[PDB]
Design a protein around this ligand. Sequence first.
Ligand SMILES: NC(=O)c1ccc[n+]([C@@H]2O[C@H](COP(=O)([O-])OP(=O)(O)OC[C@H]3O[C@@H](n4cnc5c(N)ncnc54)[C@H](OP(=O)(O)O)[C@@H]3O)[C@@H](O)[C@H]2O)c1
Ligand SMILES: O=C(O)C1(c2ccc(-c3cc(Cl)cc(Cl)c3)c(F)c2)CC1
Length: 316
Amino acid sequence: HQCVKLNDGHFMPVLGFGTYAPPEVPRSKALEVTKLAIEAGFRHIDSAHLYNNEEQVGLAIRSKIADGSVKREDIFYTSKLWSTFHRPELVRPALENSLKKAQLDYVDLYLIHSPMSLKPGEELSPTDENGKVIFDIVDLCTTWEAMEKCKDAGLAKSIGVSNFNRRQLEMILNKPGLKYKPVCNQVECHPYFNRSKLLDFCKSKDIVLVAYSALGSQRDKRWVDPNSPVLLEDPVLCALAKKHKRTPALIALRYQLQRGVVVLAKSYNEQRIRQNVQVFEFQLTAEDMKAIDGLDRNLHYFNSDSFASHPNYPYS
Ligand SMILES: NC(=O)c1ccc[n+]([C@@H]2O[C@H](COP(=O)([O-])OP(=O)(O)OC[C@H]3O[C@@H](n4cnc5c(N)ncnc54)[C@H](OP(=O)(O)O)[C@@H]3O)[C@@H](O)[C@H]2O)c1
Ligand SMILES: O=C(O)C1(c2ccc(-c3cc(Cl)cc(Cl)c3)c(F)c2)CC1
């Protein structure tokens, strides 16, 4: 039930529910499982305009609020500005549109989803006559300024970023007249890509690293190489799981918590959802932690093939 204090004074629960499902998963499932996650103890819910599920996620919270299970102030709710909305004048309207879909007065946290700005307009993934995604050039410091206006108007209690590397964080950090540092940076983080260098950097700046694909990602065929290793079949995680008689997933989650990383976990399965809350019931030894440290293989599960050429692609 622990939270971590953010550098603007707000608190964030260290365990979060990921809500993204691919589009073939029907939208009514996001409503169901967000309800199950709250019943199970999740209070930190991660969504995004890209996910096409914020209305369902908002309806889940409203329902659990109306049945007396939680109050609005107990729920930590996250959304993200998609990359077609980086131009500063589009940021407050994008946030306001998310608030209307979810039917909430504020978000607990608003993020820049990705630093790879994209052609503004209505399509989430605008593409040219030759199938290429269409980039756009935007000064992210102006985007950030508009983010800061959103906190001031109280529509976002906290603001942060996602998928930034060190050079992009410093750019916000070294901004003349910077009012609010980012509270966090949400990045792909798991034993095969542990981001120890970035984590050390964010720790020195009082910026929380938040892990996604902490369980090795959904291995979606649009993005993930089928030949890539399966995180949860890893013999060291499996050996550790038997020792504590937990599960591999639970080893992977506990690893992030003990190194001070806030960890997300997606599951659309009732039983696995309730299992993940058990991450608070045990602890790994310092030597288990070193063993997991040695799995790092610089492996990004997400294959960028029209994105590697983006000037702001963060694995450059
Ligand atoms: N900011 C970004 O760019 C970004 C990028 C990616 C993701 N995210 C967010 O963070 C979340 C990241 O997670 P992810 O979507 O990449 O998937 P993930 O958390 O890495 O999970 C991958 C798979 O593990 C399964 N799983 C969950 N619990 C399990 C358990 N106890 N035992 C065995 N398997 C289990 C799930 O399958 P089942 O559903 O069948 O249980 C899930 O599909 C996303 O949902 C999204 O909210 C953000
Ligand atoms: O859950 C998410 O946020 C998704 C996602 C997954 C990955 C990315 C992403 C991938 C690469 Cl290779 C690079 C960057 Cl900056 C973001 C992204 F922008 C969005 C699956 C929709």
